[PDB]
Amino acid sequence: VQLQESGPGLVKPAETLSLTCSVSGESINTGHYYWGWVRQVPGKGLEWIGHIHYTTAVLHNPSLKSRLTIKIYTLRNQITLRLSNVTAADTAVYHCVRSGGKPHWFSPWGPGIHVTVSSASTKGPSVFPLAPSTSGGTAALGCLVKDYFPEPVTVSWNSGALTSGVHTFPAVLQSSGLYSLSSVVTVPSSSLGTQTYICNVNHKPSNTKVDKRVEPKS
Amino acid sequence: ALTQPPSASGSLGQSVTISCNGTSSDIGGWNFVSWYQQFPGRAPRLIIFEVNKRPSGVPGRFSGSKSGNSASLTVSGLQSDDEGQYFCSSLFGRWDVVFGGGTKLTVLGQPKAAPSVTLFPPSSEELQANKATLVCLISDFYPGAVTVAWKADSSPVKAGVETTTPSKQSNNKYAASSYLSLTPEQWKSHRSYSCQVTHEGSTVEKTVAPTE
Numbered sequence A: 001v002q003l004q005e006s007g008p009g010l011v012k013p014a015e016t017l018s019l020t021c022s023v024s025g026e027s028i029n030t031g032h033y034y035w036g037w038v039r040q041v042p043g044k045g046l047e048w049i050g051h052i053h054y055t056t057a058v059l060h061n062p063s064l065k066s067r068l069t070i071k072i073y074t075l076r077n078q079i080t081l082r083l084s085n086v087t088a089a090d091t092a093v094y095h096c097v098r099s100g101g102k103p104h105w106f107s108p109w110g111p112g113i114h115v116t117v118s119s120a121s122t123k124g125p126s127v128f129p130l131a132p133s134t135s136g137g138t139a140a141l142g143c144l145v146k147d148y149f150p151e152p153v154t155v156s157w158n159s160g161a162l163t164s165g166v167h168t169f170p171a172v173l174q175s176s177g178l179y180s181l182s183s184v185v186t187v188p189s190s191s192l193g194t195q196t197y198i199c200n201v202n203h204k205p206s207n208t209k210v211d212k213r214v215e216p217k218s
Numbered sequence B: 001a002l003t004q005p006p007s008a009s010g011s012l013g014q015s016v017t018i019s020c021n022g023t024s025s026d027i028g029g030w031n032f033v034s035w036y037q038q039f040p041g042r043a044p045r046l047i048i049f050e051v052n053k054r055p056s057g058v059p060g061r062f063s064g065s066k067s068g069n070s071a072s073l074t075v076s077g078l079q080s081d082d083e084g085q086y087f088c089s090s091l092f093g094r095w096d097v098v099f100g101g102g103t104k105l106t107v108l109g110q111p112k113a114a115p116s117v118t119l120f121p122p123s124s125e126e127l128q129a130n131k132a133t134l135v136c137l138i139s140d141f142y143p144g145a146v147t148v149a150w151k152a153d154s155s156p157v158k159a160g161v162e163t164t165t166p167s168k169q170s171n172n173k174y175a176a177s178s179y180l181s182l183t184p185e186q187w188k189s190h191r192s193y194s195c196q197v198t199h200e201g202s203t204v205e206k207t208v209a210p211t212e
């Protein structure tokens, strides 16, 4: 019913990539569903890594097959993907997958986890406030998330209690190679003096969480 | 792998067809061809699992067909929602699944929407990191194409600019952002800075000054 992917977001070149998938809403035991991994790469479309089902029936993608190891744990409800001799060509968003039927169609898909393949070091973001630039009865205020690596960051407002009028912009790669993005929320102007707005920035690759309160300039 | 066109387009209410071409062993040989929908920033979603057939959620506007080695996906009565990237999948042998390169589908009859531009000066907290960033946020516009130019006083700035490619958003319109990086000194050494966003021959300019 629902799928989740976990594992490191950064891998150094020539090192092995390990990822785990946890399935909820379904047994991992049924006649017959294979369970699996598919990936998406920048500058190209989807590439099927392959799927495994118990006891040990597996399918592997050619070229990939030599590096690639895949194991299924039925007891935990967890599946694991391993890929060796990782090269920049393996930088990709990896999706957990349920195969259906030998299977030919994939659903549902896990949200996916980014993996960047680089020798560069990890760096948490610097978060700076953007003070409220008004439309009558509505002001925009936000957070600037600068110089982080690698992707992604997530942003919420007031611990998730704010969803109306929230927009988070796509990140920018820079000449430095550090990413930056910003997130903004539209709020009633009358509320600025009485209500406190806090953006919650999460960056899993560096295990950084930053909660920045944004104050109106005086 | 499988071959599909890089892009395709149609008007609202109208029909669009995109194709997936394969080797005798891939599409001509076996019945199974799946089709997937991916909105940007989201995981793909299954639209077809067997060349004709449809999953329980999927709308009837989506239909599949096959002829020899070629597979076709047809979207009938286009909606702004349908604008996205579409992929096709077929079996290569007992041992393999193969994916098409993907097709970018735009709906081509849609109303123009002017961008909303918000410009932010460097925060005080930032300016004593010894850094300075001007932030130009552009939202709620269609078509998804803009030009961004920066001005120091009346003269153009090229050095510090970084600009995103525009991308689709939940409301079905487009957002983009542009950043100008400065040292605190050059920030303080000018009267004002400006962000100009040009969209469909019309421009919006916002200005910020260190004195604010």
Ligand SMILES: *[C@@H]1O[C@H](CO)[C@@H](O)[C@H](O)[C@H]1NC(C)=O
Pocket: A085, A087
């Ligand atoms: C591992 O990948 C690297 C990438 O440069 C390549 O040079 C090397 O030949 C690969 N190793 C083997 C045993 O193929």
Ligand SMILES: *[C@@H]1O[C@H](CO)[C@@H](O)[C@H](O)[C@H]1NC(C)=O
Pocket: B003, B004, B005, B019, B020, B021, B070
């Ligand atoms: C695929 O092959 C079909 C055969 O009917 C052709 O008509 C179509 O234009 C082709 N498309 C591509 C992208 O090769």
